[PDB]
């Protein structure tokens, strides 16, 4: 029942999921060079004169701001989360959202590129590599993570529980009631363990594999925040959205 409630909250609150992404990825407009990036912008984000890399940077920020709002509503729907001290809810979301974001982005990624703009575009991995430093260094580690993550062949029922476990993490810095959160996480992880054994009877190590992926995600996010800081202090026109500034502020 806890598993079902978490899965239903995931289906309700996230506009994109692995089934919807797989349906599309089998017709999105392909962004693979400067010309098609410009055409996609005219069609899909008509509002925006700046460098191509900074324009993509601002589209990326806007995407992340939307996903944080989806994750906040998802978290509120996790049984017990709303019983926590509000300050601890903030702390859980602050440290959890980007691990959740990069885990879920894997659902829209393949070896050649990734869905963007609510499924209406597909940006190639090579085009992103072709951008000027430091922007060409941002997505490649995320593609590397996603290739291995997708090899586990999780479905949306698995991922919903994985994301809940990421959010409900008792060892975030600055938590007031560490004990309540640890207890809440123990129940989620218990339901995830049982779910993996029923849904993936062929992979007896899937649960410890996924525990390792949450540690990999923590390190991926730490390194990503270092790129955020390199951009914020060197890039002339790369203004941070205030919500994302709040999230990155004093996080590692």
């Amino acid at each position: 029942s806890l598993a079902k409630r978490i899965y239903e909250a995931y289906l309700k609150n996230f506009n994109m999921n692995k089934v919807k992404a797989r349906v599309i990825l089998s017709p999105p407009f392909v962004i693979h060079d400067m010309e098609t990036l410009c055409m996609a912008e005219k069609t899909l984000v008509a509002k925006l004169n700046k460098e191509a890399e900074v324009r993509i940077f601002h589209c990326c920020q806007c995407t992340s701001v939307e996903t944080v709002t989806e994750l906040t509503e998802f978290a509120k729907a996790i049984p017990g989360f709303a019983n926590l001290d509000l300050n601890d809810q903030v702390t859980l979301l602050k440290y959890g959202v980007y691990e959740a974001i990069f885990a879920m982005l894997s659902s829209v990624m393949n070896k050649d590129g990734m869905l963007v703009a609510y499924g209406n575009g597909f940006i190639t991995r090579e085009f992103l590599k072709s951008l000027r430093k430091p922007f060409c260094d941002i997505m490649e580690p995320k593609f590397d993570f996603a290739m291995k993550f997708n090899a586990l062949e999780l479905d949306d029922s698995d991922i919903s529980l994985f994301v809940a476990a990421i959010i409900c993490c008792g060892d975030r810095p600055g938590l007031l009631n560490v004990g309540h959160i640890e207890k809440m996480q123990e129940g989620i992880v218990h339901v995830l363990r049982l779910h993996l054994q029923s849904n993936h009877p062929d992979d007896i190590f899937l649960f410890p594999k996924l525990l390792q992926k949450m540690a990999d995600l923590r390190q991926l996010v730490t390194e990503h925040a270092q790129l955020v800081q390199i951009i914020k202090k060197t890039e002339s026109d790369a203004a941070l959205h205030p919500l994302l500034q709040e999230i990155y502020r004093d996080m590692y």
């Binding site: 709002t69 906040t72 509120k76 509000l86 903030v90 979301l93 919500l243 709040e246």
Partner: peptide, 10 residues
């Protein structure tokens, strides 16, 4: 307060 706090409050 904070933008996250606002988000958590409906």
């Amino acid at each position: 307060p904070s933008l996250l706090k606002k988000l958590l409050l409906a």
